[PDB]
Amino acid sequence: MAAYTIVKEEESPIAPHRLFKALVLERHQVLVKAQPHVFKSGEIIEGDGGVGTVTKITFVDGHPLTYMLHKFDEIDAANFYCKYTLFEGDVLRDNIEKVVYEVKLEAVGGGSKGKITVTYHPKPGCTVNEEEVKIGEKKAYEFYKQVEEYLAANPEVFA
Ligand SMILES: O=S(=O)(O)c1cccc2cccc(Nc3ccccc3)c12
Ligand SMILES: O=S(=O)(O)c1cccc2cccc(Nc3ccccc3)c12
Ligand SMILES: O=S(=O)(O)c1cccc2cccc(Nc3ccccc3)c12
Ligand SMILES: O=S(=O)(O)c1cccc2cccc(Nc3ccccc3)c12
């Protein structure tokens, strides 16, 4: 209050159900698949796949960042809908309390329409860097481009 937020709207030739599974439900695992150079493991530490499930993504040894943990706060997996929060790990940078992601997908002929909102939460009475915004939008977005391309040339996967 006030918080920094991106609002993006995208579309890819990939059906929502395949994207929501690769970029949400099994993200922790798909990150170690598209970027084996920068991530060692991604796991669930308690939970199912439902609100309160916590994941852990661990960086490779020669990376500056250390690990991340996210909590699943709202899933409606049928509707392609997720709100999830980066709460812990060396990743955070000092003026931001958490990062809060809200995803909804929808089908669109042969593919997808995502609307994503990423809200950057400063810690008690601090300010949020705008460089981090641009870094957080480039790192998620390339990863999506790697995944898209990948779900594109193997229709089999998550299909
Ligand atoms: O990493 S990605 O292709 O992005 C990927 C994205 C989403 C789901 C995946 C499932 C299996 C293997 C993958 N990759 C992979 C690639 C070559 C060999 C083994 C696995 C998946
Ligand atoms: O927008 S991104 O920054 O990659 C992004 C960031 C965070 C979570 C996302 C979840 C699903 C799809 C995304 N992108 C997307 C791309 C194409 C079509 C629909 C969604 C997500
Ligand atoms: O992209 S950033 O991290 O923002 C970045 C920002 C500024 C300078 C960078 C130099 C090399 C690699 C980067 N990225 C990178 C990240 C992980 C693995 C390898 C390279 C740099
Ligand atoms: O963005 S994510 O989608 O989690 C992501 C996806 C793929 C690779 C990433 C590497 C480093 C940091 C990330 N996140 C991040 C968090 C805050 C600021 C900048 C980057 C990465």
The whole-angstrom distance between residue 5's C-alpha and the CA centroid of its chain comes to: 15
Domain that holds residue 107: 1-159
Query: How many other CB atoms are there within 10 angstroms of residue 81's CB atom?
Result: 16
Ligand with the closest atom to the CA of 93: 4
Type and span of the H or E element at 4:
strand 4-12
Identify which of 91, 135, 137, 142 to mutate to test ligand 3's pocket (most ligand atoms within 8 A of the CB): 135
Pocket of ligand 2 from Cβ distances under 6 Å: 8, 10-12, 19, 23-24, 101, 103, 112, 114, 116, 140-141, 144
What kind of experiment solved this structure? X-ray
Residue 79 near residue 104 (C-beta atoms within 8 A): yes
CATH for 13:
3.30.530.20
CA distances from 100 to 38, 59, 150 (A): 22, 21, 26
- State the closest ligand 3 atom to the C-alpha of 38, by its place in the atom list counted from 1: 18
The number of folded domains in the chain is 1
Instruction: Output the CA torsion sign for 39, 156, 81, 6.
Output: positive
